[PDB]
Write a protein that binds this ligand. Structure first.
Ligand SMILES: Cc1cc(OCC(=O)O)cc(C)c1Cc1ccc(O)c(C(C)C)c1
Length: 251
């Protein structure tokens, strides 16, 4: 009864089914999402003399923690039954597709305006310049800009969880075989997501559509990291890249 409810002007909140789904995804996020309500005291600021060509000292610090952050993204998908309902091959294509998007979202929401830093793997707090010089180049700006911009959105774990699921179920991923099914899943997430937002009633105008634009920028970040990675594989040798990192980001 969606279109009609809208047209009148009712902002529909989550159904019982959608609430169930919401709790499934939220729990999944929070389990694979390093610490909470206290991620700040727990962060250790990277020595300012690191990351002032790829600065290999900085690159090295990032490559140590890049594997756990990646595995936590896979852990998140594992805890989603719809993800399980998919074939070996689609699952892998989906993970490779969304990995940098989710990691980057996760780094973005842990942006702190005071220190002007982001937190990686829940522990490591870096500045724009550090992350840029450590290999990300302009991908660092993109993540920092996103993080500053998201401050106003006041996301909760549930909103970040849903956003993650939407990223995960992207049927445009090349080589997929589950297009129709992956689209059914995403639509299902987007629908719970919007109802959750109606229920949350943020005092930001056009919240929903503004949120959707964030998704797009996260895809831009992913696509761009793909290109950065090519640049790195020339400004550093394969040797420096953790095996999982290579698994995920190179065809
Ligand atoms: C290391 C790292 C971890 C991360 O995850 C945070 C977490 O899952 O909470 C999120 C981001 C954006 C990064 C930074 C990063 C992400 C990708 C990448 O290729 C590089 C190279 C310089 C090694 C660094």
């Amino acid at each position: 009864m969606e279109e009609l409810q809208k047209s009148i002007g009712h902002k529909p909140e989550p159904t019982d089914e959608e609430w169930e789904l919401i709790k499934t995804v939220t729990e999944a996020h929070v389990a694979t999402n390093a610490q909470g309500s206290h991620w700040k005291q727990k962060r250790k600021f990277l020595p300012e003399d690191i990351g002032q060509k790829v600065d290999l000292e900085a690159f090295s610090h990032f490559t140590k923690i890049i594997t756990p952050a990646i595995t936590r993204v896979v852990d998140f998908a594992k805890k989603l039954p719809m993800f399980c309902e998919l074939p070996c091959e689609d699952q892998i294509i989906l993970l490779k597709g969304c990995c940098m998007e989710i990691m980057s979202l996760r780094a973005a929401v842990r942006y702190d305006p005071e220190s002007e830093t982001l937190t990686l793997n829940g522990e490591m707090a870096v500045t724009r310049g550090q992350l840029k010089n450590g290999g990300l180049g302009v991908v660092s700006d993109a993540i920092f800009d996103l993080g500053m911009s998201l401050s106003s959105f006041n996301l909760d774990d549930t909103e970040v969880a849903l956003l993650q699921a939407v990223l995960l179920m992207s049927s445009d991923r090349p080589g997929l075989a589950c297009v129709e099914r992956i689209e059914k899943y995403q639509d299902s997430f987007l629908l719970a997501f919007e109802h959750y937002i109606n229920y949350r009633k943020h005092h930001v105008t056009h919240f929903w559509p503004k949120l959707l634009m964030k998704v797009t920028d996260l895809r831009m970040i992913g696509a761009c990291h793909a290109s950065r990675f090519l640049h790195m594989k020339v400004e550093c040798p394969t040797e420096l890249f953790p095996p999982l990192f290579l698994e995920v980001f190179e065809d």
